[PDB]
Amino acid sequence: SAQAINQAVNNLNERAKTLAGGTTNSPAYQATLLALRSVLGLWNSMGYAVICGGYTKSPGENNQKNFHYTDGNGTTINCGGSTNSNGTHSSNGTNTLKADKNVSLSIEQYEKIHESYQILSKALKQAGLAPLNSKGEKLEAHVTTSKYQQDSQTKTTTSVIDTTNDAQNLLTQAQTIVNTLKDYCPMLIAKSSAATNTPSWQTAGGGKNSCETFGAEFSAASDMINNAQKIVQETQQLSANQPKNITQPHNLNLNTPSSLTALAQKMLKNAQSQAEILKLANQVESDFNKLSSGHLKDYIGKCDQKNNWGNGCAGVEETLTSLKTSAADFNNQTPQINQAQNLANTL
Amino acid sequence: AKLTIESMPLSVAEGKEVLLLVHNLPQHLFGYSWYKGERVDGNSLIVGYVIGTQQATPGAAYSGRETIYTNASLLIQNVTQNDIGFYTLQVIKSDLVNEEATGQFHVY
Ligand SMILES: [Ca+2]
Ligand SMILES: [Ca+2]
């Protein structure tokens, strides 16, 4: 009957709008956010130890660049230099040897990580993640670096990037950070014989290859982003297939066997998109558990001269809880969606 | 204690070969490089090696006669008068602290 069909349509559409447009109540949004915060947490946890500044074309370059971070305390990462045995800074360090896979990042590769990190961080701070069915809003991200001048001074530059807080843009930034590490596998700095405290994974003696130390972690973070991107794509497929209620229920010229079969198949596409989104959202939770169960187990989920390098400081545990709570709400509504499919299938 | 270079032999005949041996090489290294002359200078790079890579990278001062080993030794074969003077080794340790040493040999 038309009463029953309109009920099933209203169930689908109400559930879809929460899923596509909700924040706190949408596991799609919470999964996407979890992936973004996880990548920020990854970089806050181990990014400081990444060796950078290997030369690209020529060792005559003698290139150095400094990259600026702010918690509210500020820190600075040098790429290219080293420290002399007496403690003074040397302009000849990692830049004396060639940048490539399993060695170090180039200055160009590091500045891409750094920029993506500042965009992602500042977007989430200034605007939050936009709803997944939204265009998002424009915002300005600031990226601060410095360079050494002829003999004397250090010149600091603050760049302004016009960017947005939509999921697709932010997932792209996260993907840049993860793929740079996973594809170029830079070496990590060892503990000595800008972090105050030393995490357990950063041992004295020999340095470790980042893909050896964090192979499982990088793969988990990469899968989180890829599944989040698919959530975003399914959410737009959901926003396309929005079935209409039957008006004029008794009018068989308006409501034909053709138009009602098209409606029924639109209802099924909506429901199948919803199911796939929730499955992806559960896979993101599974991948977060992979990410947070190895070397980063006592680090990624926590936050406390002084700086927060070595800890995640990204609110991942809070988001995980909100993912679980919202996912359970949608899972409890599965019976009213199964009957809505069974209602559509008979047509 | 400190990184030092030994030339072998101390004085070399023209056409012959010389080995720059390294004493007190630190145990935990990121990489190292050899330079022609008395200064660390990319323009005078003979060859650099990164730990874990299996293959060294030559620089502008490379002449086809130099072999680096993973004890940081540098062998120079078919020596001439142009090879007179200083050679510099820089080492980058795993914590990004560097050490530097100078070698030399006479030629006749
Ligand atoms: Ca930090
Ligand atoms: Ca190795």
Coordinates of C-alpha atoms and ligand atoms in Angstrom, one line a residue:
Chain A
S1 CA 0.0 0.0 0.0
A2 CA 0.9 3.7 -0.4
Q3 CA 0.7 4.2 3.4
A4 CA 3.5 1.6 3.9
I5 CA 5.6 2.8 1.0
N6 CA 5.6 6.4 2.3
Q7 CA 6.6 5.2 5.8
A8 CA 9.6 3.2 4.4
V9 CA 10.6 6.3 2.3
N10 CA 10.4 8.6 5.3
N11 CA 12.6 6.1 7.3
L12 CA 15.2 6.0 4.5
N13 CA 15.2 9.8 4.0
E14 CA 15.4 10.6 7.7
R15 CA 18.3 8.1 8.3
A16 CA 20.1 9.3 5.1
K17 CA 19.9 13.0 6.1
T18 CA 21.4 12.3 9.6
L19 CA 24.1 10.1 8.0
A20 CA 24.9 12.6 5.2
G21 CA 24.3 15.9 7.0
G22 CA 24.9 15.1 10.7
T23 CA 28.0 15.8 12.8
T24 CA 27.8 14.3 16.3
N25 CA 25.1 11.7 15.2
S26 CA 26.7 10.6 11.9
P27 CA 29.1 7.6 12.0
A28 CA 30.1 8.6 8.4
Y29 CA 31.2 12.0 9.6
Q30 CA 32.8 10.6 12.8
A31 CA 34.7 8.0 10.8
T32 CA 35.9 10.7 8.3
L33 CA 36.9 12.9 11.2
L34 CA 38.7 10.0 13.0
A35 CA 40.8 9.4 9.9
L36 CA 41.8 13.1 9.7
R37 CA 42.6 13.3 13.4
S38 CA 44.5 10.0 13.3
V39 CA 46.9 11.4 10.6
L40 CA 47.5 14.6 12.7
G41 CA 48.1 12.3 15.7
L42 CA 50.5 10.2 13.6
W43 CA 52.6 13.3 12.7
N44 CA 52.5 14.7 16.3
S45 CA 53.6 11.3 17.6
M46 CA 56.6 10.6 15.2
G47 CA 57.0 13.4 12.7
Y48 CA 59.8 15.2 14.6
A49 CA 62.1 12.1 14.2
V50 CA 61.8 12.1 10.3
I51 CA 65.2 12.9 8.7
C52 CA 65.0 15.6 6.1
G53 CA 67.1 17.9 3.9
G54 CA 69.0 15.5 1.7
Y55 CA 70.2 17.3 -1.5
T56 CA 68.1 17.0 -4.7
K57 CA 70.3 18.0 -7.6
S58 CA 73.7 19.1 -6.2
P59 CA 75.5 18.9 -2.9
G60 CA 76.8 22.5 -3.8
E61 CA 73.2 23.6 -3.0
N62 CA 74.0 23.5 0.7
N63 CA 70.2 24.0 1.3
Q64 CA 68.6 24.3 4.7
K65 CA 65.0 25.2 5.7
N66 CA 63.3 25.6 9.1
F67 CA 59.7 24.6 9.6
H68 CA 57.7 26.2 12.5
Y69 CA 55.0 24.5 14.7
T70 CA 52.8 25.9 17.5
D71 CA 51.0 23.7 20.1
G72 CA 50.6 27.0 22.7
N73 CA 54.4 26.7 22.7
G74 CA 56.4 27.0 19.5
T75 CA 58.9 24.5 18.0
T76 CA 61.1 24.6 14.9
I77 CA 62.4 21.7 12.8
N78 CA 65.7 22.1 10.8
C79 CA 66.0 20.2 7.5
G80 CA 69.5 20.1 6.0
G81 CA 71.8 20.9 8.9
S82 CA 73.4 18.9 11.7
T83 CA 74.9 19.5 15.1
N84 CA 78.7 19.7 15.6
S85 CA 80.4 17.6 18.3
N86 CA 80.8 20.7 20.5
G87 CA 77.0 21.5 20.2
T88 CA 77.0 24.3 17.6
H89 CA 74.9 24.2 14.5
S90 CA 76.4 23.1 11.2
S91 CA 75.1 24.1 7.8
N92 CA 76.5 20.8 6.5
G93 CA 74.4 17.9 7.7
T94 CA 71.7 15.8 6.0
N95 CA 72.2 18.1 2.9
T96 CA 75.7 16.5 2.4
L97 CA 74.0 13.3 1.2
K98 CA 71.4 12.6 -1.5
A99 CA 67.7 12.6 -0.7
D100 CA 65.8 9.5 -1.8
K101 CA 63.7 6.5 -0.7
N102 CA 65.1 4.9 2.5
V103 CA 67.4 7.9 3.2
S104 CA 65.8 11.3 3.9
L105 CA 63.1 13.5 2.6
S106 CA 64.0 16.5 0.3
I107 CA 63.2 20.0 1.6
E108 CA 60.5 20.0 -1.1
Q109 CA 58.9 16.8 0.3
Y110 CA 59.1 18.0 3.9
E111 CA 57.5 21.4 3.0
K112 CA 54.6 19.5 1.4
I113 CA 54.0 17.5 4.6
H114 CA 54.4 20.6 6.7
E115 CA 52.0 22.6 4.5
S116 CA 49.4 19.8 4.4
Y117 CA 49.7 19.4 8.2
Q118 CA 49.2 23.2 8.8
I119 CA 46.1 23.2 6.4
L120 CA 44.6 20.2 8.0
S121 CA 45.3 21.4 11.6
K122 CA 44.1 25.0 11.0
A123 CA 40.9 23.9 9.0
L124 CA 39.8 21.6 11.9
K125 CA 40.6 24.3 14.5
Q126 CA 39.1 27.3 12.8
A127 CA 36.0 25.7 11.1
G128 CA 35.8 22.0 12.0
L129 CA 35.1 19.4 9.4
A130 CA 32.2 20.5 7.1
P131 CA 29.2 18.1 6.9
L132 CA 29.8 15.5 4.3
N133 CA 27.0 16.7 2.0
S134 CA 28.2 20.4 2.3
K135 CA 30.4 22.4 0.1
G136 CA 32.3 23.6 3.2
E137 CA 33.6 27.2 3.8
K138 CA 36.6 29.1 2.8
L139 CA 39.4 29.8 5.3
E140 CA 43.0 31.0 5.5
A141 CA 45.8 28.8 6.7
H142 CA 49.1 30.2 7.8
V143 CA 52.4 28.3 7.1
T144 CA 55.5 29.6 8.8
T145 CA 59.1 28.7 7.8
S146 CA 62.5 30.3 8.0
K147 CA 65.8 30.3 6.1
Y148 CA 69.4 31.3 6.6
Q149 CA 70.7 34.5 5.0
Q150 CA 74.2 35.6 3.7
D151 CA 76.3 35.1 6.9
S152 CA 74.3 36.9 9.5
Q153 CA 70.5 36.5 10.0
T154 CA 67.5 34.1 9.8
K155 CA 64.6 35.4 7.7
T156 CA 61.1 34.1 8.7
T157 CA 58.2 34.0 6.2
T158 CA 54.6 33.4 7.0
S159 CA 52.6 32.2 3.9
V160 CA 48.9 32.4 3.6
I161 CA 47.0 29.6 1.9
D162 CA 43.3 30.0 0.8
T163 CA 41.7 26.7 1.6
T164 CA 38.5 24.9 2.6
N165 CA 37.2 22.7 5.4
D166 CA 35.4 20.1 3.1
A167 CA 36.1 16.4 3.6
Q168 CA 37.7 15.9 0.1
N169 CA 40.2 18.8 0.5
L170 CA 41.2 17.7 4.0
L171 CA 41.5 14.0 3.1
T172 CA 43.8 15.1 0.3
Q173 CA 46.0 16.8 2.8
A174 CA 46.1 13.7 5.1
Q175 CA 46.9 11.5 2.1
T176 CA 49.9 13.8 1.2
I177 CA 51.3 13.3 4.7
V178 CA 50.8 9.5 4.8
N179 CA 51.9 8.7 1.2
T180 CA 55.0 10.8 1.4
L181 CA 56.1 8.7 4.4
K182 CA 54.9 5.3 3.1
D183 CA 56.5 5.8 -0.4
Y184 CA 59.8 7.4 0.6
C185 CA 60.4 5.7 3.9
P186 CA 62.8 8.2 5.4
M187 CA 65.2 7.2 8.1
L188 CA 64.4 8.2 11.7
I189 CA 66.6 10.1 14.1
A190 CA 68.0 7.9 17.0
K191 CA 68.0 9.0 20.6
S192 CA 71.4 10.5 21.6
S193 CA 73.9 8.6 23.8
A194 CA 62.3 18.7 19.3
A195 CA 60.8 16.2 21.9
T196 CA 61.3 16.6 25.7
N197 CA 60.3 13.0 26.5
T198 CA 61.6 10.0 24.5
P199 CA 59.0 7.5 23.3
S200 CA 59.7 3.8 23.6
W201 CA 60.1 3.2 19.8
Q202 CA 62.9 5.8 19.5
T203 CA 65.9 3.8 20.8
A204 CA 69.5 4.8 21.3
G205 CA 72.2 3.5 19.0
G206 CA 71.2 3.0 15.3
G207 CA 68.5 4.9 13.5
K208 CA 65.5 3.1 12.1
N209 CA 63.8 3.2 8.7
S210 CA 60.3 4.8 9.2
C211 CA 58.6 2.0 7.1
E212 CA 60.3 -0.7 9.2
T213 CA 59.3 1.0 12.5
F214 CA 55.8 2.1 11.4
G215 CA 55.0 -0.2 8.4
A216 CA 51.7 -1.5 10.0
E217 CA 50.9 2.0 11.3
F218 CA 51.4 3.7 7.9
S219 CA 49.2 1.0 6.2
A220 CA 46.5 1.4 8.8
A221 CA 46.5 5.2 8.4
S222 CA 46.5 4.9 4.6
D223 CA 43.5 2.5 4.7
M224 CA 41.6 4.8 7.1
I225 CA 42.0 7.7 4.6
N226 CA 41.1 5.5 1.6
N227 CA 38.0 4.2 3.3
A228 CA 37.0 7.7 4.5
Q229 CA 37.3 8.9 0.8
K230 CA 34.9 6.1 -0.2
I231 CA 32.5 7.2 2.5
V232 CA 32.5 10.7 1.0
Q233 CA 31.9 9.3 -2.4
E234 CA 29.0 7.0 -1.2
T235 CA 27.5 10.0 0.7
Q236 CA 27.2 12.0 -2.5
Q237 CA 25.7 8.9 -4.2
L238 CA 23.2 8.9 -1.3
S239 CA 22.5 12.6 -1.7
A240 CA 21.7 11.9 -5.4
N241 CA 19.2 9.1 -4.8
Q242 CA 16.6 10.7 -2.5
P243 CA 13.2 8.9 -3.1
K244 CA 10.0 11.0 -3.2
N245 CA 6.8 10.3 -1.3
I246 CA 3.7 9.1 -3.2
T247 CA 1.3 11.9 -3.6
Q248 CA -2.2 11.3 -5.1
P249 CA -2.1 7.6 -3.9
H250 CA -5.3 6.6 -5.8
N251 CA -4.3 8.4 -9.1
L252 CA -3.0 5.5 -11.3
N253 CA -2.1 8.0 -14.1
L254 CA 0.3 9.8 -11.8
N255 CA 1.4 6.7 -10.0
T256 CA 2.0 4.1 -12.7
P257 CA 3.7 0.6 -12.5
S258 CA 6.7 2.4 -14.3
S259 CA 7.1 5.3 -11.9
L260 CA 6.6 3.0 -8.8
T261 CA 9.2 0.5 -10.0
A262 CA 11.6 3.5 -10.5
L263 CA 10.8 4.7 -7.0
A264 CA 11.3 1.2 -5.5
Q265 CA 14.7 0.9 -7.2
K266 CA 15.7 4.4 -6.0
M267 CA 14.8 3.3 -2.4
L268 CA 17.1 0.2 -2.8
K269 CA 20.0 2.3 -4.1
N270 CA 19.6 4.6 -1.1
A271 CA 19.5 1.7 1.3
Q272 CA 22.5 -0.1 -0.3
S273 CA 24.5 3.2 -0.1
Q274 CA 23.6 3.5 3.6
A275 CA 24.7 -0.1 4.3
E276 CA 28.0 0.4 2.5
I277 CA 28.7 3.7 4.3
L278 CA 28.1 2.0 7.7
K279 CA 30.4 -0.9 6.7
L280 CA 33.1 1.6 5.7
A281 CA 32.7 3.4 9.0
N282 CA 33.2 0.1 10.9
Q283 CA 36.3 -0.7 8.8
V284 CA 37.7 2.8 9.7
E285 CA 37.3 1.8 13.4
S286 CA 39.1 -1.5 12.8
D287 CA 42.0 0.4 11.0
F288 CA 42.2 2.9 13.9
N289 CA 42.7 -0.1 16.2
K290 CA 45.5 -1.3 14.0
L291 CA 47.1 2.2 14.0
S292 CA 46.8 2.6 17.8
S293 CA 47.9 -0.9 19.0
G294 CA 51.7 -1.0 18.1
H295 CA 54.5 1.4 18.9
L296 CA 52.0 4.3 19.2
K297 CA 49.7 2.6 21.7
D298 CA 50.8 4.7 24.7
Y299 CA 51.2 7.9 22.6
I300 CA 48.7 8.6 19.8
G301 CA 45.6 8.9 22.2
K302 CA 47.3 11.1 24.8
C303 CA 48.2 14.7 25.4
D304 CA 49.8 16.6 28.3
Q305 CA 61.2 24.5 26.6
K306 CA 58.3 22.1 27.0
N307 CA 56.4 20.6 24.0
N308 CA 54.0 17.9 23.0
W309 CA 56.0 16.0 20.3
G310 CA 55.8 12.3 20.9
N311 CA 52.1 12.4 21.8
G312 CA 49.1 12.5 19.4
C313 CA 47.3 15.5 20.9
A314 CA 44.6 15.1 18.2
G315 CA 41.5 14.1 20.2
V316 CA 41.3 10.6 18.6
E317 CA 39.9 8.8 21.6
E318 CA 37.0 11.3 22.0
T319 CA 36.2 10.9 18.2
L320 CA 36.4 7.1 18.5
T321 CA 33.8 7.2 21.3
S322 CA 31.5 9.4 19.2
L323 CA 32.0 7.0 16.2
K324 CA 31.0 4.0 18.4
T325 CA 27.9 5.8 19.9
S326 CA 26.6 7.0 16.5
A327 CA 27.4 3.7 14.8
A328 CA 25.3 1.8 17.5
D329 CA 22.4 4.1 16.9
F330 CA 22.4 3.4 13.2
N331 CA 22.9 -0.4 13.9
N332 CA 19.8 -0.4 16.2
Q333 CA 17.7 1.1 13.3
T334 CA 18.6 -1.9 10.9
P335 CA 15.3 -3.7 11.3
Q336 CA 13.2 -0.7 9.9
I337 CA 15.6 -0.5 6.9
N338 CA 15.5 -4.3 6.2
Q339 CA 11.6 -4.2 5.9
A340 CA 12.0 -1.1 3.8
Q341 CA 14.1 -3.1 1.3
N342 CA 11.8 -6.1 1.5
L343 CA 8.9 -3.7 0.8
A344 CA 10.7 -2.3 -2.3
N345 CA 11.8 -5.8 -3.6
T346 CA 8.2 -7.1 -3.8
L347 CA 7.5 -4.1 -6.2
Chain B
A1 CA 88.5 8.6 21.1
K2 CA 88.4 11.0 18.2
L3 CA 87.9 10.2 14.5
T4 CA 91.4 10.1 12.8
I5 CA 92.7 9.3 9.3
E6 CA 95.8 7.2 8.5
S7 CA 97.4 7.3 5.0
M8 CA 98.9 4.0 3.7
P9 CA 101.5 4.5 2.5
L10 CA 102.5 7.8 4.0
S11 CA 104.2 8.9 0.8
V12 CA 103.1 7.5 -2.5
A13 CA 104.9 6.9 -5.8
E14 CA 103.2 8.3 -8.9
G15 CA 101.1 5.7 -10.7
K16 CA 100.6 3.7 -7.5
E17 CA 97.8 3.7 -4.9
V18 CA 97.0 5.0 -1.4
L19 CA 94.5 3.9 1.2
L20 CA 93.0 6.4 3.7
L21 CA 92.1 4.3 6.7
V22 CA 89.7 5.5 9.3
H23 CA 90.3 5.0 13.1
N24 CA 87.5 5.4 15.7
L25 CA 84.6 5.4 13.2
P26 CA 81.5 5.8 15.4
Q27 CA 79.3 2.7 15.5
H28 CA 75.9 4.3 14.8
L29 CA 75.9 6.3 11.5
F30 CA 73.4 7.8 9.2
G31 CA 76.1 8.3 6.5
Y32 CA 79.4 9.8 5.6
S33 CA 81.3 11.5 2.8
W34 CA 84.8 12.2 1.5
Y35 CA 85.9 15.6 0.2
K36 CA 88.9 16.7 -1.8
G37 CA 90.8 19.3 0.3
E38 CA 90.6 20.5 3.9
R39 CA 87.0 21.6 4.1
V40 CA 83.6 20.0 4.0
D41 CA 82.3 21.5 0.8
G42 CA 79.7 20.0 -1.6
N43 CA 81.6 21.4 -4.6
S44 CA 84.6 19.2 -3.6
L45 CA 82.6 16.0 -2.8
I46 CA 84.4 12.9 -4.0
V47 CA 81.8 10.4 -2.8
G48 CA 79.0 9.9 -0.1
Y49 CA 77.5 6.8 1.3
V50 CA 74.3 6.3 3.4
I51 CA 74.0 3.4 5.8
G52 CA 71.5 0.8 4.5
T53 CA 71.7 1.7 0.7
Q54 CA 74.2 -0.7 -0.8
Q55 CA 75.4 2.0 -3.3
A56 CA 77.6 5.1 -2.9
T57 CA 76.9 8.4 -4.7
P58 CA 79.8 10.3 -6.4
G59 CA 80.3 14.1 -6.5
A60 CA 82.1 16.6 -8.6
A61 CA 85.6 15.7 -7.3
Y62 CA 85.1 12.0 -8.3
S63 CA 87.8 11.0 -10.9
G64 CA 86.9 7.3 -11.5
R65 CA 89.9 6.2 -9.3
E66 CA 88.4 6.3 -5.8
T67 CA 86.7 3.4 -4.0
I68 CA 84.8 3.9 -0.8
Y69 CA 84.3 1.0 1.6
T70 CA 81.8 0.6 4.5
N71 CA 84.6 0.9 7.1
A72 CA 84.8 4.4 5.6
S73 CA 88.2 3.8 3.9
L74 CA 88.9 5.6 0.7
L75 CA 91.2 3.9 -1.8
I76 CA 92.8 6.1 -4.5
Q77 CA 94.5 4.3 -7.4
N78 CA 96.7 5.5 -10.2
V79 CA 97.8 8.5 -8.1
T80 CA 99.3 11.7 -9.7
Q81 CA 100.7 15.1 -8.5
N82 CA 97.1 16.6 -8.8
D83 CA 96.1 14.3 -5.8
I84 CA 98.6 16.0 -3.5
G85 CA 97.2 17.6 -0.4
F86 CA 94.3 17.2 2.0
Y87 CA 91.3 15.0 2.1
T88 CA 88.4 15.5 4.5
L89 CA 86.0 12.8 5.9
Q90 CA 82.6 14.0 7.5
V91 CA 80.5 11.5 9.3
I92 CA 76.8 12.0 10.2
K93 CA 75.9 10.0 13.3
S94 CA 72.4 8.5 13.9
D95 CA 71.4 11.3 16.3
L96 CA 72.5 13.9 13.6
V97 CA 75.7 14.9 15.4
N98 CA 78.6 15.1 13.0
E99 CA 82.4 14.4 13.3
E100 CA 85.1 15.5 10.9
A101 CA 88.7 14.3 10.1
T102 CA 91.5 15.2 7.8
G103 CA 94.0 13.0 5.9
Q104 CA 97.0 13.7 3.6
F105 CA 99.7 11.9 1.7
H106 CA 102.9 13.1 -0.2
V107 CA 103.5 12.1 -3.8
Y108 CA 106.7 11.9 -5.8
Ligands
CA1 CA 53.5 19.3 18.0
CA2 CA 68.7 -2.0 7.0

